């Protein structure tokens, strides 16, 4: 998955999230065209596959011909009451996409973190099943303590949680940030 955010000079905007699903998709590359094919069929639920311990299938997300599989993707554009874009945001990184997108919005909109900080700020994730709270390596450990004393079992993500690209309107114009977890950098004028 990759997320990209754009704001043009006229104030129009695009939030685009694209994916071939797992790393290198199906692992099928065409020797002639070079196209690397998705494994998006894996995003369906299957009745005979035991996905996770104690997690049943979701019948709403079973394979039918012509059906699109459920996705965690959520490319978002926030617009102010005056019609001007306020934030362009989304994420990559599997089931953590939605939680990470929520966190980036919370961080900027409510906690007052500037866009770069909103992107770089440590994240955490819980998706109910499985039943564990994952936190990034550099999270404020007072947060970890607050969670554990409230009976969350936490564990630390061996790499990182998601990748966020974002743009936010400021008095100085359009502030952009790409996530250092993957190494991107924005550009503009």
């Amino acid at each position: 998955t990759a997320h990209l955010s754009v704001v043009a000079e006229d104030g129009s905007a695009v939030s685009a999230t694209s994916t071939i699903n797992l790393y290198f998709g199906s692992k099928v590359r065409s020797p002639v065209s070079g196209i690397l094919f998705n494994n998006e069929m894996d995003d369906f639920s299957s009745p005979s596959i035991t996905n996770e311990f104690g997690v049943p299938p979701s019948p709403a997300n079973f394979i039918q011909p012509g059906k699109q599989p459920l996705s965690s993707m959520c490319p978002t554009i926030m617009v102010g009451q005056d019609g001007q874009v306020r934030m362009v945001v989304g994420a990559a990184g599997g089931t953590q996409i939605t939680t990470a997108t929520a966190l980036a919005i919370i961080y900027n909109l409510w906690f007052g973190y500037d866009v770069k900080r909103a992107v770089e700020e440590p994240r955490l994730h819980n998706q109910l099943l499985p039943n564990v709270t994952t936190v990034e390596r550099n999270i404020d450990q007072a947060v970890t303590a607050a969670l554990e004393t409230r009976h969350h079992h936490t564990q630390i993500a061996s790499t990182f949680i998601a990748v966020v690209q974002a743009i936010v309107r400021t008095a100085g114009g359009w502030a952009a940030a790409s996530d250092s977890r993957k190494g991107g950098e924005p550009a503009g004028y």
Partner: protein
């Protein structure tokens, strides 16, 4: 340098692709032109993540009409697919049978028909060069190559481009994508039809089937990107948030944020350890309540999600869930009432 820009901005996950997007804007492109040009480049530099073999969604806001739209160009199950076609995760994750019908290029075409200002071919030009000339492998791709070292090294058609002397490329080493360069060139000149009903089509079907897949020419001919004029929105303060409904996770996002909005988070919510710890606790619980309802979601053309989605975007419902969040404890799974049937 600082990444605050007076006029326009592109935030991609590779520097050169953000730049390519930015140049398109400079040369008179719309935000859509820039997004397509940048996406084409990301498909090269982060080929593990996305590309013309996959699918996407675009949320687009027009500053003039003050309207938002969504373009759905996500992959679909092929016409020969069925509910019980897979019996292990390995079957659904590897090989041609794991492949759904790619929508990427029809999505770029629809967006471009609606919002493009630059010529189609111009959007591909810088990525054709890049693929043909080569580029140093970035951090993100390098870690992805390391992660799948084994499968890549043992697969000669992937190692062809993703190795140097039989071993996966590392950060700094040169990656060239000479076949994709030709493919991008054909796309630029013959348009989207080359992929779906044109000079690339039969080779696509052949590659997918040779690897055990079931995609046919008919699937490609029939794929359509979909314009959604009324995306999901929620109201947050004086703002509106536009995001895609099912089969994407806008409704999950909506529910998380509507749960949390009744706590009136501010700078104070994170100023002391006491407030901060409680705040992050409340976030996790909102995540759990929202993921509970997620298991009822699916493609709305195949499954009736009208009321589920209605609830997931309702502030009242979110308030009902917030009132069940205990400030002193998390709860067992059943507490959140995950549902697998209506």
């Amino acid at each position: 340098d600082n990444h605050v820009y007076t006029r326009a901005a592109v935030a991609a996950d590779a520097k050169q692709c953000s730049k390519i997007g930015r140049d398109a804007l400079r040369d008179g492109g719309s935000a859509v032109d820039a997004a397509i040009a940048a996406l084409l480049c990301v498909g090269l530099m982060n080929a593990h993540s996305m590309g013309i073999g996959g699918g996407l969604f675009l949320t687009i806001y027009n500053s003039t009409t003050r309207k938002a739209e969504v373009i759905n160009a996500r992959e679909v199950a092929p016409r020969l697919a069925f509910a019980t076609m897979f019996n292990s995760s390995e079957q659904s994750q590897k090989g041609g049978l794991s492949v759904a019908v790619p929508g990427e290029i029809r999505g770029y075409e629809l967006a471009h028909q609606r919002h493009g200002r630059l010529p189609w071919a111009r959007l591909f030009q810088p990525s054709i060069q890049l693929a043909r000339q080569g580029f140093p492998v970035g951090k993100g791709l390098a870690a992805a190559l390391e992660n799948k070292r084994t499968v890549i090294e043992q697969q000669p058609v992937l190692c062809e481009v993703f190795c140097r002397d039989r071993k996966v490329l590392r950060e700094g080493e040169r990656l060239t994508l000479p076949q994709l360069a030709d493919t991008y060139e054909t796309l630029a000149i013959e348009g989207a039809q080359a992929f779906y009903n044109g000079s690339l089509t039969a080779q696509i079907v052949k590659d997918i089937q040779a690897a055990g897949g079931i995609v046919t020419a008919e699937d490609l001919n029939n794929y359509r990107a979909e314009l959604i004029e009324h995306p999901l929105n929620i109201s947050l303060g004086d703002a509106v948030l536009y995001m895609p409904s099912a089969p994407l996770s806008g409704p999950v996002l909506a529910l998380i944020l509507n749960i949390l909005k009744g706590y009136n988070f501010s700078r104070e919510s994170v100023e002391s350890p006491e407030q901060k710890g409680l705040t992050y606790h409340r976030i996790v619980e909102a995540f759990r309540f929202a993921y509970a309802k997620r298991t009822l979601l699916g493609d709305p053309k195949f499954v009736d999600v009208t009321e589920v989605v209605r609830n997931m975007t309702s502030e009242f419902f979110a308030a009902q869930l917030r009132a069940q969040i205990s400030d002193d404890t998390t709860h067992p799974i059943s507490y959140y009432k995950p549902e697998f049937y209506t």
